[PDB]
Amino acid sequence: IGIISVWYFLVMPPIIMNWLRVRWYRRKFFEMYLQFMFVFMFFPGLLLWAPFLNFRKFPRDPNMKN
Amino acid sequence: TGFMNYGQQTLRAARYIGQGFMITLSHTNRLPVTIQYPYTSERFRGRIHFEFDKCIACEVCVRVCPIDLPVVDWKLETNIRKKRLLNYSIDFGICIFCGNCVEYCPTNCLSMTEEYEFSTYDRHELNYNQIALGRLPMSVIDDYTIRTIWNSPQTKNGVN
Amino acid sequence: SIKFPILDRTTKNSVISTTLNDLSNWSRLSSLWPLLYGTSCCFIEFASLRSSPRQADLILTAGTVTMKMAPSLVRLYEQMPEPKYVIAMGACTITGGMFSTDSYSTVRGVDKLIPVDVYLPGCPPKPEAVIDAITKLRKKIAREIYKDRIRRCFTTNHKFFVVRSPH
Amino acid sequence: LMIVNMGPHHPSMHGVLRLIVTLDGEDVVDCEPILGYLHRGMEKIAENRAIIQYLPYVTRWDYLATMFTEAITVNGPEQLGNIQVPKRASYIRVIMLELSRIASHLLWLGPFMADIPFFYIFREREFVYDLFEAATGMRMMHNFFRIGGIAADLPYGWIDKCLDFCDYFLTEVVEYQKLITRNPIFLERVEGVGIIGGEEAINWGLSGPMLRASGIPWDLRKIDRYESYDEFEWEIQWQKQGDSLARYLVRLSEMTESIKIIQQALEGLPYRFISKKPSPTFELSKQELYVRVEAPKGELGIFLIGDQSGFPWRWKIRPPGFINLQILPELVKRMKLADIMTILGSIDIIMGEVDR
Amino acid sequence: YGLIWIFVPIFSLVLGIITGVLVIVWLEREISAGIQQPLGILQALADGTKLLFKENLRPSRGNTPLFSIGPSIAVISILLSYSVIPFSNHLVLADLNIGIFLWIAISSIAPIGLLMSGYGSNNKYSFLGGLRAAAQSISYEIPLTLCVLSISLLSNSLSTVDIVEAQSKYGFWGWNLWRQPIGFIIFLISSLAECERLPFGYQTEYSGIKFGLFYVASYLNLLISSLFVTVLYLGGWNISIQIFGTTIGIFITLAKTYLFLFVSIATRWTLPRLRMDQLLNLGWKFLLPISLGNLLLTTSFQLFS
Amino acid sequence: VKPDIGQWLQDVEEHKAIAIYAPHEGGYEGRYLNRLKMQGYYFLDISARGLGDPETTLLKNYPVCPAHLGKQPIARWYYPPEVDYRLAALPPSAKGLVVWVLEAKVLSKSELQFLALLPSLRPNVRVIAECGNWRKFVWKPLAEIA
Amino acid sequence: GQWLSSVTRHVRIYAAYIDPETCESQMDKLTLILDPTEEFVWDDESCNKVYSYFQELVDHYEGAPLTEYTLRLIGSDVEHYIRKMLFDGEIQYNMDARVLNFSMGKPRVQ
Ligand code: SF4
Ligand code: SF4
Ligand code: SF4
């Protein structure tokens, strides 16, 4: 069960959060309904992915002018 | 048959709850707009842009103001009609941005901008100078987190 | 002309204690949750952005405060006394607003009534101005390390009876 | 008889007010409305300020519809000096005043439906404030009323959005009309209150929705020939059901009547921005002039005794809703703590014009 | 070994219900961000630590033991009855011969915490609010335990794992949605209405950790009512129309409790307060007689079984 | 997030002029200010969104000019300076430096930011903690463009 | 109602049964709470001087009805006395609160 636990706690949560990102607007309320059910079922694996956020913000083709 | 009338009232109630549930389920489909943080036209009347050498005489900002807040000291220079203006002190805690002297200026060096991010940590910091009031705020197209704000259009559904 | 602090040392200088202080401060800077406090022209930002008057310590004063409003306001701050502060989100919570000269029944700012961290431009700005204000406040609380839990009560009182004349 | 405090932070959000009641049990029987909370002293400062300086001050009265306050306080000096407004700017003023009446009634029924949600009306309100931004530029803090009309001109996008507002707005209005016929909780939770009739609402002080709730076709701008009201389509609510749902049908019919007025005024276009502007500064005369306009709450009024100076010698305002607040001491006698929320909703009042 | 294997289902269950109340907080925030238009997942723990690290805020009233244990009993009255849920054919906390009956007792000791809250607060506001909250916890208990009784009468068992197995005989139609939809409506209105959620304070002196206790007690009340929606009407782990059966069954019952969370929060946002008179008109003159009515119906119907 | 390193403290004690490129994503900015405050220092605040002539405001006792509401006179008095009075606002001796926390990178003028960074080089106990125009991550670039 | 006070910064009337910091119920015992916000230094001898001055002011200014207007007058000239005491340097500031707004203006070089 430790193999299945690290599988469900490592492979699942970035794909789950990615499906939460890329399907935030492209959804029926049926689709938002099943996504809400999925994110309710799939909560405590998202603890190692909650503070880290890397591929999130570039809605252009900009340059790092900082 | 009073409990039958209670049942008929709840039948009409269940019909209304189902119809209003369809209405609210359709109301939950407001996906494209979603106003939030970024993470208007020229008459925003936000932060007031000021120019120092174009400000010359008539002191109309201290007169048409509803509270008379502007404090500008001036000493007349001889034979050249120069008032020697100094320290254009505007307190935005005193200021309402109600906009009288913005359009009532004879010089019209008072113009408005779109800046409103003046939430500060102290009240004595709000006493601004004439060089702080001459700063171009922001070109809001040129941010990596701000897209085009839906000014002319509405419900574009183009971000997705 | 100011006073002098103590400034002896920082006793909690382990990695675990400063880690817990940083995490508790950042989570304290994350969970604003205001009790709203509208009932004025700055209530209009609430629809774009509890009821127990001792719960929410991170309230911002988004309202036009008057002299008759002031006893209930200082009682409500007595109901939020120790942990957190208030944010002035109105020119009338700062300078008295547009009636700063001639208004008798309106206080010239709550800066003579309550400790205020952040002063706003005042009259209803855009709904992201309150977001920038609570972000600044989060940067302010992030500077705070909970003052190393350092405590003083004055307790000034006269037990002589006043020359009273009630109704 | 446990005394309710009725504190400053109400469980509802309709202003700050004081309604201490003895309430023997849950039946409220005696009302003592204490006011003075949102007070500014408009009269003495208005005596100490000019018209162009108390003209930014007319925003703190009925700020859910700010066109009415500045409209009546600019229509004061227009009829005082007998300066003619051209027909184009006056009709555009009629359009924006009826749009502000629309905004006042929808911003009433928003938090009223929230107490008894926000984005069910904000889908409309974002385009409504887009119309306010295309009309004057501000959200609700406009300063665009002159003696000759609007201070600026209408842009070429605002007339197109005004043409689009009718089939953007009336469809969701009539989708919101059928809810009270469908949903019986409005037929059982706000049904009943408002038991005053017409001969009594004329008797005390009432005007607006509380006077049109009894089936009286009352209108100032129909009796007084003002802004050519008999040209446009009118249907003043003669709904005689009395109660609070009668007031809701009154407000739906007033919004639909304003929709009909604006829809007939979409293609009217009978004429510049400001007529009679030689100089930036002027004065006022000394007459005995009380000017009034059809408020959304009923006969907003401006009393004026002149000084022939830069300052008015007397400036007293008769607000509609503050005279409409007098009837609750009589509409408190046989109701509940669960009823006073519906009462202070159906008064349709904010405390900006109350204390002032 | 003598206590580790016994403690770890309790520990895993406490961690599971903390994650579930995190789900309920951020899921009501997500439905409010859908109907009202990452960092947000940890914002709920930030809420919990904002409510945790605070001031005690004790006034001058001399009811300090009741002031301490008021919100504590309000938490216990939900937390003690999480030993009851058969998430699968295994991983239930106890065998629990009286399954739902202990839940009815622990949910019935909740007005004790409500009256202890109404007396721990030296305020007439929270006094009247504790009276109202205790009275609506009392008032909505009877059709609640009536439809509980009717489902346990269909199953002829009180133990929850037995009724969860018993729902899977006819198949998809064997669930109690198609056996008692009327009693399902009873359990819907009793689940939504009791927790001061579907109609509507009384925390005007409780602050700091006690306000957080009332917070977590209300949302765990929502959690346990939702998990009984799962294990009564929707099914525990059966989708008919080793180790992996437990792992798929916990996903099935969590999808069912997410379904009821979405239905409950949506019905909260689309219904207002019953204004406290139709509330009791419902729970006494309407809801209790029709709960007795479908009790008589299921009593007549179990003769042939 | 939360990369455990005090390299920003090394930058503020080495360069003492760093643009804090950090978003409006909550309070992820004051943690290094809290570590400077826990080191015995004292940190006060400023903002360049309405600060004009910054060297004439931090020194040279810029004027008070109280805003009369049409009732009082001009009363051209001289208020004490910003950072000179802040150096006068250190009553004990254990305070090693004074941190000037600036939180407005826009409306700043590149020339005047270099003038303010040179004013952080004027007093040895002055630390410049300016903003960095709100990048997505937390970047501590030094005053190179200014 | 029950609160009868004119409470500002550094001056709070609070005519209630307050011996210690626990509020109550209301009586003729005016409990002058000073400095709620930790704005100035407020040494104990100077606090005793200001409290004795306020006692002399409420002793010489009574005789009329002690309603709210006398409370406004006595808090107002008590704040004038605190301002003229801090301007002469008897009351320094604090710089230990999170604001330190310098509510009475910066002391000049005069
Ligand atoms: S800016 Fe306006 S008020 Fe100032 S001197 Fe010029 S004309 Fe006069
Ligand atoms: S911006 Fe507005 S308040 Fe300020 S001086 Fe100009 S007109 Fe007066
Ligand atoms: S400053 Fe003006 S808009 Fe803001 S709260 Fe006060 S009166 Fe209202």
UniProtKB/Swiss-Prot annotation, chain C:
Annotated membrane topology: Peripheral membrane protein
EC number: 7.1.1.-
An example Gene Ontology CC term for this record: plastid
Cofactor (UniProt): [4Fe-4S] cluster
Sorted UniProt keywords: 4Fe-4S, Chloroplast, Iron, Iron-sulfur, Membrane, Metal-binding, NAD, NADP, Plastid, Plastoquinone, Quinone, Thylakoid, Translocase, Transport
Residues that coordinate or bind [4Fe-4S] cluster: 41-42, 92, 123
One GO BP annotation of this record: photosynthesis, light reaction
Top EC class for this record: translocase
Function comment: NDH shuttles electrons from NAD(P)H:plastoquinone, via FMN and iron-sulfur (Fe-S) centers, to quinones in the photosynthetic chain and possibly in a chloroplast respiratory chain. The immediate electron acceptor for the enzyme in this species is believed to be plastoquinone. Couples the redox reaction to proton translocation, and thus conserves the redox energy in a proton gradient.
Family (UniProt): Belongs to the complex I 20 kDa subunit family.
The protein's name in its UniProt record: NAD(P)H-quinone oxidoreductase subunit K, chloroplastic
Gene source species: Arabidopsis thaliana
Curated annotation (Swiss-Prot), chain D:
Catalytic activities: a plastoquinone + NADH + (n+1) H(+)(in) = a plastoquinol + NAD(+) + n H(+)(out); a plastoquinone + NADPH + (n+1) H(+)(in) = a plastoquinol + NADP(+) + n H(+)(out)
EC number: 7.1.1.-
Enzyme class: translocase
Subcellular localization: Plastid, Chloroplast thylakoid membrane
Main subcellular location: plastid
Gene3D superfamilies attached to this UniProt entry: Cytochrome-c3 Hydrogenase, chain B
GO biological process: photosynthesis, light reaction
GO molecular-function term, one example from the UniProt record: oxidoreductase activity, acting on NAD(P)H, quinone or similar compound as acceptor
Family according to the record: Belongs to the complex I 49 kDa subunit family.
Protein name from the UniProt record: NAD(P)H-quinone oxidoreductase subunit H, chloroplastic
Lineage, opening ranks: Eukaryota, Viridiplantae, Streptophyta, Embryophyta, Tracheophyta
Gene designation: ndhH
From Swiss-Prot, chain F:
Naturally occurring in which organism (per UniProt): Arabidopsis thaliana (Mouse-ear cress)
Protein name, UniProt field: NAD(P)H-quinone oxidoreductase subunit N, chloroplastic
Gene Ontology CC terms: chloroplast; chloroplast envelope; chloroplast thylakoid membrane; NAD(P)H dehydrogenase complex (plastoquinone); plastid
Catalytic activity reported: a plastoquinone + NADH + (n+1) H(+)(in) = a plastoquinol + NAD(+) + n H(+)(out); a plastoquinone + NADPH + (n+1) H(+)(in) = a plastoquinol + NADP(+) + n H(+)(out)
EC main group: translocase
Family: Belongs to the NDH complex subunit N family.
Membrane topology, from the record: Peripheral membrane protein
Biological process annotations from GO: defense response to fungus; NADH dehydrogenase complex (plastoquinone) assembly
Residues of the full protein shown: 58 to 203 of 209
Function: NDH shuttles electrons from NAD(P)H:plastoquinone, via FMN and iron-sulfur (Fe-S) centers, to quinones in the photosynthetic chain and possibly in a chloroplast respiratory chain. The immediate electron acceptor for the enzyme in this species is believed to be plastoquinone. Couples the redox reaction to proton translocation, and thus conserves the redox energy in a proton gradient.
Keyword terms: Chloroplast, Membrane, NAD, NADP, Plastid, Plastoquinone, Quinone, Thylakoid, Transit peptide, Translocase, Transport
GO molecular function terms attached to this record: oxidoreductase activity, acting on NAD(P)H, quinone or similar compound as acceptor; quinone binding
Catalytic activity, EC: 7.1.1.-
UniProt-annotated location(s): Plastid, Chloroplast thylakoid membrane
Secreted recorded as keyword: no
UniProtKB/Swiss-Prot annotation, chain G:
Keyword field: Chloroplast, Membrane, NAD, NADP, Plastid, Plastoquinone, Quinone, Thylakoid, Transit peptide, Translocase, Transport
Recorded GO MF terms: oxidoreductase activity, acting on NAD(P)H, quinone or similar compound as acceptor; quinone binding
Record note on disruption phenotype: Malfunction of the NDH complex.
GO CC terms of this entry: chloroplast; chloroplast thylakoid membrane; NAD(P)H dehydrogenase complex (plastoquinone); plasma membrane
Record membrane topology: Peripheral membrane protein
Subcellular location: Plastid, Chloroplast thylakoid membrane
Biological processes per GO annotation: NADH dehydrogenase complex (plastoquinone) assembly
Listed EC numbers: 7.1.1.-
This protein's record includes keyword Chloroplast: yes
Reaction it catalyzes: a plastoquinone + NADH + (n+1) H(+)(in) = a plastoquinol + NAD(+) + n H(+)(out); a plastoquinone + NADPH + (n+1) H(+)(in) = a plastoquinol + NADP(+) + n H(+)(out)
Enzyme class, first EC level, given as a word: translocase
Major subcellular location class: plastid
The protein's role, per its UniProt record: NDH shuttles electrons from NAD(P)H:plastoquinone, via FMN and iron-sulfur (Fe-S) centers, to quinones in the photosynthetic chain and possibly in a chloroplast respiratory chain. The immediate electron acceptor for the enzyme in this species is believed to be plastoquinone. Couples the redox reaction to proton translocation, and thus conserves the redox energy in a proton gradient.
Family: Belongs to the NDH complex subunit M family.
Protein name: NAD(P)H-quinone oxidoreductase subunit M, chloroplastic
Species of the source: Arabidopsis thaliana (Mouse-ear cress)
Full protein segment contained here: 87 to 199 of 217
